[PDB]
Amino acid sequence: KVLRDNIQGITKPAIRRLARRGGVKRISGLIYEETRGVLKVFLENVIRDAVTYTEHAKRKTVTAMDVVYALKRQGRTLYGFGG
Amino acid sequence: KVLRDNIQGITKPAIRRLARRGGVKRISGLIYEETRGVLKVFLENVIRDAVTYTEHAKRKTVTAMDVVYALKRQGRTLYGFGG
Amino acid sequence: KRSRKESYSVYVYKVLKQVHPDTGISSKAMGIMNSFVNDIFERIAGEASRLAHYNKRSTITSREIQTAVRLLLPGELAKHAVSEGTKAVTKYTSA
Amino acid sequence: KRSRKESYSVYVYKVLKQVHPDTGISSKAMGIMNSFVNDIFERIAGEASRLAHYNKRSTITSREIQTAVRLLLPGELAKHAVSEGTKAVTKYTSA
Amino acid sequence: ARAKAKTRSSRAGLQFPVGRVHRLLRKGNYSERVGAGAPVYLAAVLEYLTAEILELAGNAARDNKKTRIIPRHLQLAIRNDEELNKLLGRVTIAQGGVLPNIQAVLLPK
Amino acid sequence: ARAKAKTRSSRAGLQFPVGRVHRLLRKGNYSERVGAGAPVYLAAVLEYLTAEILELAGNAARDNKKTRIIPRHLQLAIRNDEELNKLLGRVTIAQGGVLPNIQAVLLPK
Amino acid sequence: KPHRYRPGTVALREIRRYQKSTELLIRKLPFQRLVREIAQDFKTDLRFQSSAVMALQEASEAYLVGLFEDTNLAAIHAKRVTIMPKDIQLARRIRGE
Amino acid sequence: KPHRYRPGTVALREIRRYQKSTELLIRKLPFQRLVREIAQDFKTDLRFQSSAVMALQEASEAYLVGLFEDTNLAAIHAKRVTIMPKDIQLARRIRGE
């Protein structure tokens, strides 16, 4: 029930696949851990917002509405999840 | 009555001092005409909407409030003129 | 027993059939169409509301939304939306 | 005389005299403070209005504005503004 | 004793619902009053935008020779139109991927 | 036998107007109904933000040996607090100029 | 002698594949675990709708896609092809992060 | 021999001056002429408040100043100190314009 080191769960080839979809030929080795950190900070932002939406809603389960709405506020609007 | 060339009205030393406020130590020679065009495009985006505000209000006089609204709709909000 | 959840299914369905008699749609593309029309409606409605507040107008007319779609919709889409909305209010007032 | 143009002038002047007895203010700085209070009021009120719509709530209360502070205001600014919000509302409920 | 109900969607000749757009405008709380021509104009704009993007989606799907449009087709439609890309610059389409855009230096030779 | 007209800002111990912010919530048309503690809280947040930024403005004025706040003091107070900077990243102060910052590459050795 | 491609063409075949294809690029379970780990630090005992987890999945992949396009522009700006930490720092700082 | 400063030194003094200074850097009436020229392209014979022209001038200076912040960042990104049109285009593209 304790979760300790899940930032390493976003594997290095997963980052390679992400950069391939973004259109990258070559990825340095220093890239993976800081993109883990950057994505970490990004989820800190959006999940902090969604947690505030959640505790405002007096529910205990984070929903897709809270996700898409938190992305919507930050100029990162997402389609396809009931918005 | 008609005006043909005020793009050169934003002189090269004016662009120089703008970039000096911008922290630019050295400016290429090809910068000035491009920034004149870029400012012209930015003013297209602002002034077209500011005009649309004015004949939305059926006014002939362009007001500072319309300019403030047009800037802040682009997310480039200007303080000091509202009210 | 269930509660009704509103969507923009049938309208997008009739439009896609009208512009393409033979072409179908997936469910996820339908969700993205629902999200798109909701986003555009909220943008135009918010900008119309702000235009209403800025000239101290408590009413929203087609002039207000015309101003808004002139603000948001870039270039050629603006004049085409002006054309269809003008024709639409033309048939609405004539009937 | 003309129509009165509302401002936040004497209010910000009282705040300055409370925080800095000997420091003055300029008129352009006061216009920027009017722009500040109007902009922050606009941001908080707009996001809290959307929060009211999202939970299908007809009421905006101190809870919605508090949550809006947690979204918009960063970090220690957020939690301190929460602290003075709670002291203000407890003083108001105690009249 | 009463006239037959005939919708303003049919009055304007637009398949988008005038009544539902008016209801969402009233309950979206944007003004105290809304003029009757405003939802008609808004629904016309909405139907034009949907018709244009669905036209591009159907054309792109026919280009992929597939009779049903998918979110990939929506991404291909949106990113290939400069005015639609201006309208949807910051908007993300789910499971649509990205437009194939490889920079010119990335190609060999 | 009507009571004395007391003010809600003084009732809450504030300087910013509870009444005017409440009226602007009613007239900004943001909800049909507004809770009573909401304008008090919003005025508290506004007064605290203005309190910190005027405190930093007075401190910057005392730093520049000026007894009066100039908009340059306001811009220096915004940009020297990184959290206030993140609050107001997209907002430009009139006649504030820009914060003095030179990249170290630009500076000579 | 067994076959071996020169460096780069496998990368471009990947480019064409995952730009042509649409599917999710992060393994779903460790992404879900990372999200639960982060949300545990903010408010305790959170559960997640599965659709919310895929929503963070799509949004995160697209966010990284936008960043990696920006770092691609930064890298080709700097006459390079292999991106560096200062490219992501530039992209975030120009965008205002 | 008359006194003579090396290049960039006067530029650096100009730097420290213009972040030290707060006044407008665009000439007022030529900017008024430019904004009237742009305005008459949309609606002829428009009239301007002087405060509106000053607000447009302040916003234009703000836009360009922030644009050259990003441009200077992109220039030092490419190990250069003199900005180029590709720096401006890069900053404008990454910003989302």
Numbering used by the authors:
A (entry chain b), B (entry chain f): 20 to 102
C (entry chain h), D (entry chain d): 30 to 124
E (entry chain g), F (entry chain c): 10 to 118
G (entry chain a), H (entry chain e): 37 to 133
Task: Pull verbatim passages from the article behind this deposition.
Here, we report cryo-EM structures of human H1-containing tetranucleosome arrays with four physiologically relevant NRLs. The structures show a zig-zag arrangement of nucleosomes, with nucleosomes 1 and 3 forming a stack. H1 binding to stacked nucleosomes depends on the NRL, whereas H1 always binds to the non-stacked nucleosomes 2 and 4.
In all structures, nucleosomes 1 and 3 form a canonical stack, whereas nucleosome 2 is located in a DNA loop between the two stacking nucleosomes and is rotated relative to the nucleosome stack. Thus, histone H1 is bound to non-stacked nucleosomes in all structures, whereas H1 binding to stacked nucleosomes is enabled only as the NRL increases.
